[PDB]
Amino acid sequence: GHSYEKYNNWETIEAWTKQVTSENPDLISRTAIGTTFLGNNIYLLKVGKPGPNKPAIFMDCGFHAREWISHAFCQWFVREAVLTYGYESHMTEFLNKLDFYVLPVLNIDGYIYTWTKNRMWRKTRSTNAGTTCIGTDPNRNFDAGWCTTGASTDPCDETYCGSAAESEKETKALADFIRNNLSSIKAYLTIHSYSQMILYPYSYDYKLPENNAELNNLAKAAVKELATLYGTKYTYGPGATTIYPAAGGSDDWAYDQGIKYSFTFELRDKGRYGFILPESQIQATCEETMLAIKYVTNYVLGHL
């Protein structure tokens, strides 16, 4: 069965998306925004108190298959939202005023592969013409300085940028959805691990975002808020200089679409366990991350 303090396989996460929605129809609606290469359903949960023309924040998890704490966080977030609505003042206000679009797992095919065959798989599972090598790096696959830096043009490599921007059904589906809802989406949050960082644009180029000063101030405050809970220390800054250049990222693309608050989170840890973060750290990791996500949400709502 499903547990919020264990890593859950896709079959279980899928059943959870149906169950948590049916149990909370006044706060959650579920849709599918497309299919993966292997025909799995890309679910999206709209979390919020339904109402006319609300603003929104979009958050996805599970871009990269092996980053299991990412998938776990999106699930943790949804329960927090539904359990505390009506009781905790901030979350109640948040869900009254805006919607969270939560995409619990983007790269489902890769995630399944980490359960069935290879725990360290990263990419999608699409085939590539002319080779036996499988998969594209979804975070090199967006139309932002596409494949110009930090990306490989070889399908056998972990950072393969694809045959073209949005070549993958999964990234096409996410981009299609965001382009369809640009008028409402005010922030884009994409959850990864590990390294304990908050990153903002740019990553495909060393140029800085117009609101670089604001974004730095926001990230600084969010990492400060995160640390209050368990003392976990994050670093933060523009992607290119804070970790390394990587073109074709979804956060840079979202930002150049007009979404001025765009962030990549890298959750625990710092390398001791890396991608294989113990299930015993799920609760603490998710709890402290919630504080940063809520701080950002509170700020965004004050800047519509």
Ligand X SMILES: CC(C)[C@H](NS(=O)(=O)CCCc1ccccc1)P(=O)(O)C[C@H](C(=O)O)c1cccc(CN)c1
- Which residues does the annotation mark as catalytic? 266
- Find the part of the chain contacting ligand X (CB under 6 A) among 9-17, 40-48, 243-251, 278-286: 243-251
Q: According to the binding rule CB under 6 A, does residue 206 interact with ligand X?
A: no
Contact string 179-198 vs Zn ion (x = CB under 5 A): -------------x------
Shortest separation between residue 122's beta carbon and Zn ion, angstroms: 8
What residues form DSSP beta bridges with 61? Answer: 191
Choose which of 165, 178, 185, 246 interacts with ligand X (CB under 6 A).
246
Across the beta sheet with 197-200, the strand order is 28-35, 41-47, 99-103, 56-61, 185-193, 261-267, 197-200, 235-238
64 labeled part of a ligand binding site = yes
Binding string, residues 116-155; x marks residues near ligand X by CB under 6 A: -----------------------x----------------
CA 65, CA 275: separation in Å to the nearest integer?
10
Give the residues across from 29 on adjacent strands: 46
Annotate 87-136 with DSSP letters as a single string: TSHHHHHHHHH-EEEEES-S-HHHHHHHHHT-TT--S-----TTSS----
Q: Provide the minimum distance between the beta carbon of 30 and ligand X in the complex, in angstroms, as a whole number.
A: 27
Q: Which is nearer to Zn ion, 21 or 195 (CB)?
A: 195
Q: How far is the CB of 63 from Zn ion (least distance, A)?
A: 6
Residue 124's binding partner among ligand X, Zn ion, none (Cβ under 5 to 8 angstroms by kind) is none
Residue 171 within binding range of ligand X, rule CB under 6 A: no
CB atoms within 10 A of CB 83: 12
Scanning the structure block, which residue is given the tokens 């943790």? 76
Q: How many angstroms separate the CA atoms of 264 and 255, rounded?
A: 11
Element of type H or E holding 193 = strand 185-193
Q: Is 193 annotated as a binding residue?
A: yes
Tokens of 300: 């965004």
Give dist(CA 86, CA 205) in Å, integer: 43
> Which CB sits closer to ligand X, 21 or 203?
203
Residue ranges that bind Zn ion, judged by CB under 5 A: 64, 192
Residue ranges that bind ligand X, judged by CB under 6 A: 64, 139, 158-159, 192, 194-195, 199, 203, 239, 243-244, 246, 249, 251-252, 264, 266
- Numbered residues of the known binding site for substrate: 64-67, 122, 139-140, 193-194, 244
